């Protein structure tokens, strides 16, 4: 092979497929052992399964890869958004209609996204899948990267002209190349789950600004299934978590939305992850490049930062293919530095956008602050 | 009498009525001669298409309610019950509809001619208000005890004294220049084109605003069910293609092209007034026994109401300082009491001025509804 990718997640699996499509062989390393579904294995969307909001560029990226036709089987589009409020300024409704395909994006089930990616990777002869290995050494010289993976008793020694590190927020390769991270924490915790409503969503996403905070209702592939996103202050998560508070969670959703979504009949397990940002100081060190959560972990945004990672993968694929037009060295360090410079503006804009979204959770009645900020009618403050 | 208000506009008339309600006699001066309405059938009241309007806040209506005047003022004042903001963009189409919860919260749009008529009529029936019209103040001096002014009627020279002088004589206030107070001017490179239009569809107390390349185009209701006020900020230098009788059809075509059929056909437009968006601030608002009120203290244009709602709040707070001062002294124009009032108003005026900058800077913001849909983290976008 020519390229080594450390980390076999959504980003790593997607990056290996883009390289294989560009006729670039790749060794993919992953710590966990993948399920070998060999007759066969029936996919069923679980109430406790996680979801991901894909942007239009992410859908287009998978379209060029020829994978969206399969990914669409368990992904639904968002056609409209309905935003409402009822505070000390009046009731207001914001309805936005989509007209271009996937402008509001698609909500895909995570289990289906990884299954399609894993199945297609195993069909590509240019991708050598090496699961059950944990990298424990990484060195560099002027010509190659050297890694030592551990497989129980065996030692695995590999080398390549370029190493792509996509091993998650707690990346091992990032600390091996001596790169620190900056951590920004927020006093918020996102409560996500999957509920079942008597009324179908009809590809409409909902959000209600209440005293409990912004309560989201995203459509799911199931016509009567919805994905809830509910950020709250740290410590307030215990009131809604656990099987003991299943109906209490449904009661808060019912009294907030009333009958706009019908009756909240069932709910799954409520997941909680603190809102924070883990940003690496650098992304390119010699012939090693950080991709995904190894470079930046931005969870509070829609898509959990996955759309930004897919853009990094698409752009890196171009910088490597264009480099191969000039020489046989796909791991040209100056090319990796130029790639990082080309991604700086988009990454900083998303990182700043994440700060705006989290600080916006405190803003109740934002539709009527927009009405006031027009200066058209006379409020009194 | 005892208090002299210089300026017989909407502010001076309101202030004189507020002082009269508090049992405070007041002399009111004005440069223009007022038309005694009486029995002259030649001149009743008409809602002219070239007349100005004012958006009154809830507290402003509450102030006129305490004065027993809103029952008559409502005859030519309409409430805003809904606000519809539309927007079209590359990503799609969005609409925001905001309704009213409590009465008067969205405000009332009153005709300026009717407001001045009711105020002037009520002032003339108030014995505690001495109305002196056709007088122009040509001199203003002051000592430790009184203010001295000299007004001219052409041949008659009027000399008046008072313990307190309330200067409400407009943006080019003579009293502000007499006490030696300069102004600070903050200018924007935009002017606002306002006018009154008539539409085939009734507005039904619904105010509209559409964002486009022309800038934010506002359509607000008026007392006439088919009358609407247009608020249109443009860049300085391009207001000529909309002003003038020869551009009446050019102006109506731009309204029809922006709103389509949401307001029916734009049948008729009045004269287009173009006033520059700017803030004129007096360096000081109180010097001795002279105090500035209205546009004499701060001319505020970009916001709805043209600062009038701020002036009524200024007058309401001023009455509280004057009434309490009279409860402990006979000097209603104590300079230190006026200075304590000015500092207490600094917070309100400064936040209105900052709100003006926020409004003006928002004109350059096209597609604001989509930005709100983006800034909530609901769906995945990319810019
Ligand atoms: Cl105002």
CA dihedral B344, B350, B355, B356 (to 10 degrees): 120
* C-alpha atoms less than 13 angstroms from C-alpha of B239 in its C-beta half-sphere: 20
For strands A162-165 and A288-290, give the pairing: parallel
Tell me how crowded residue A304 is: count the other CB atoms within 10 A of its CB. 23
Identify the three-state secondary structure at position B292: strand
Which chain B residues have a beta carbon less than 8 Å from that of A216? 378
Q: Which of residues 341-360 of B touch A (CB under 8 A)?
A: 351, 355-356, 358-359
- How many A×B Cβ pairs under 8 Å? 164
CB B311 within 8 A of CB B294: yes
Q: What is the CATH number of domain B3-43+130-184+279-363?
A: 3.50.50.60
For strands B206-210 and B217-221, give the pairing: antiparallel
Place of tokens 């991709």: A291
Query: Judging by beta carbons within 10 Å of its beta carbon (0-12, 13-18, 19+), is residue B192 exposed, middle or buried?
Result: buried
Give ranges for CATH 3.30.9.10 in chain B.
74-110+187-276
Which chain A residues have a beta carbon less than 8 Å from that of B302? 375
Q: Which of A193, A209, A214, A204 shows the shortest CA–CA distance to A264?
A: A193
Residue B355 and residue A368: Cβ atoms within 8 Å? no
d(CA B36, CA B13): 16
d(CA A269, CA A316): 37
First to last CA, chain A: 66
Q: Is residue A305 less than 8 Å (CB to CB) from chain B?
A: no
DSSP string, B326-375: HTT-S-TT-HHHHHHHHHHHHHHHHHHHHHHHHHHHHHT---HHHHHHHT
Q: How far is CA B128 from CA B105, B122, B147, in A?
A: 33, 11, 20
B53: tokens are 């309007």
Handedness of CA A326, A330, A333, A334 (dihedral sign): positive
> What's the gap between Cα A226 and its chain centre?
18
Q: Which of A298, A237, A275 shows the shortest CA–CA distance to A358?
A: A275
Q: Which of A10, A43, A52, A56 shows the shortest CA–CA distance to A227?
A: A52
Resolution at which this structure was determined, Å: 2.6
d(CA A324, CA B206): 62
Q: What method was applied to determine this entry?
A: X-ray
CA B124–ligand 1 middle distance (angstroms): 27
Residue B378 and residue A205: Cβ atoms within 8 Å? yes
Question: Can you name the residues that pair with A232 across neighbouring β-strands?
Answer: A189
Q: How far is CA B164 from CA A96, B314, B330, in A?
A: 57, 16, 12
Pick the CATH number of A3-48+110-183+278-360 from 3.40.50.300, 3.50.50.60, 3.30.1340.30, 3.40.630.190: 3.50.50.60
CA B172–ligand 1 middle distance (angstroms): 19
Q: Is residue A101 less than 8 Å (CB to CB) from chain B?
A: no
A90, A311, A370: residue with CB nearest B100: A90
Q: Which of A291, A183, A191, A178 shows the shortest CA–CA distance to A241?
A: A191
Q: Helical H runs in A87-170?
A: 110-123
CATH class of segment(s) B74-110+187-276: alpha beta
Which chain A residues have a beta carbon less than 8 Å from that of B209? 374, 376
CB A85 within 8 A of CB A367: yes
Give ranges for CATH 3.50.50.60 in chain B.
3-43+130-184+279-363
Q: How far is CA A168 from CA A267, B258, B347, in A?
A: 29, 50, 50
A122: tokens are 């195993």
First to last CA, chain B: 67
How many angstroms separate the CA of residue A231 from the nearest CA in chain B? Answer: 11
d(CA B132, CA B159): 12
Identify the three-state secondary structure at position A24: coil
d(CA B314, CA A237): 47
Q: Where are the beta strands (DSSP E) in A213-352?
A: 213-219, 225-233, 264-267, 271-280, 284-285, 288-290, 296-298
Q: Which of residues 148-177 of B touch A (CB under 8 A)?
A: none
B151: tokens are 């007004």
Which contacts (CB < 8 Å, 24+ apart) does range A118-123 have?
A118/A13, A118/A34, A120/A17, A120/A67, A121/A13, A121/A16, A121/A17, A121/A20, A121/A28
In sequence order, the 6+-apart residues with CB closer than 8 A to the CB of B74 are B108
Residue A307 and residue B380: Cβ atoms within 8 Å? yes
* C-alpha atoms less than 13 angstroms from C-alpha of B374 in its C-beta half-sphere: 15
d(CA B337, CA B318): 10
Place of tokens 């409520």: A270
């Amino acid at each position: 092979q020519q390229v080594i990718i450390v980390g076999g997640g959504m980003v790593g699996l997607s990056l290996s497929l883009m390289l294989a499509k560009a006729n670039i062989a790749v060794k993919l390393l992953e710590a966990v052992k993948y399920p070998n579904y060999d007759d066969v294995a029936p996919y069923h969307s679980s109430f406790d399964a996680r979801n991901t909001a894909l942007s239009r560029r992410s859908v287009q990226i998978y379209q060029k890869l020829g994978l969206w036709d399969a990914l669409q089987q368990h992904a639904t589009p968002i056609l409209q958004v309905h935003i409402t409020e009822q505070g000390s300024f009046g009731k207001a409704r914001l309805v936005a209609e989509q007209e271009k395909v996937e402008s509001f994006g698609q909500v895909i089930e995570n289990a289906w996204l990884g299954r399609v990616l894993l199945t297609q990777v195993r069909q590509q002869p240019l991708i050598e899948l090496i699961d059950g290995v944990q990298v424990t050494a990484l060195t560099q010289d002027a010509e190659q990267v050297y890694i030592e993976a551990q497989r129980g008793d065996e030692i695995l020694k590999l080398e390549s002209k370029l190493l792509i590190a996509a091993d998650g927020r707690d990346s091992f390769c990032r600390q091996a190349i001596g790169v620190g991270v900056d951590v920004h924490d927020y006093d918020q915790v996102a409560i996500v789950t999957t509920v079942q409503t008597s009324k179908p969503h009809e590809h409409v996403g909902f959000e209600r600004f209440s005293a409990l905070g912004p309560l989201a209702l995203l459509p799911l592939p199931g016509e009567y299934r919805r994905s809830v996103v509910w950020p709250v202050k740290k410590g307030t998560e215990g009131e809604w978590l656990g099987e003991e508070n299943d109906q209490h969670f449904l009661d808060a959703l019912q009294k907030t939305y009333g009958d706009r979504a019908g009756k909240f009949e069932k709910t799954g397990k409520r997941f909680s992850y603190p809102l924070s940002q883990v940003l690496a100081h650098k992304q390119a060190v010699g012939r090693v490049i950080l991709m995904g959560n190894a470079a930046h972990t931005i969870h509070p945004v829609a898509g959990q930062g996955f759309n930004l990672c897919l853009r990094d993968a698409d752009v890196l694929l171009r910088y490597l293919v264009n480099q191969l037009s000039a020489s046989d060295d796909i791991g040209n360090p100056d090319n990796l530095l130029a790639y990082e410079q080309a991604r700086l503006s988009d990454q900083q804009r998303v990182i700043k956008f994440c700060d705006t979204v989290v600080r916006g959770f405190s803003n109740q009645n934002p539709l009527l602050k927009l009405i006031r900020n027009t200066g058209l009618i006379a409020f009194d403050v």
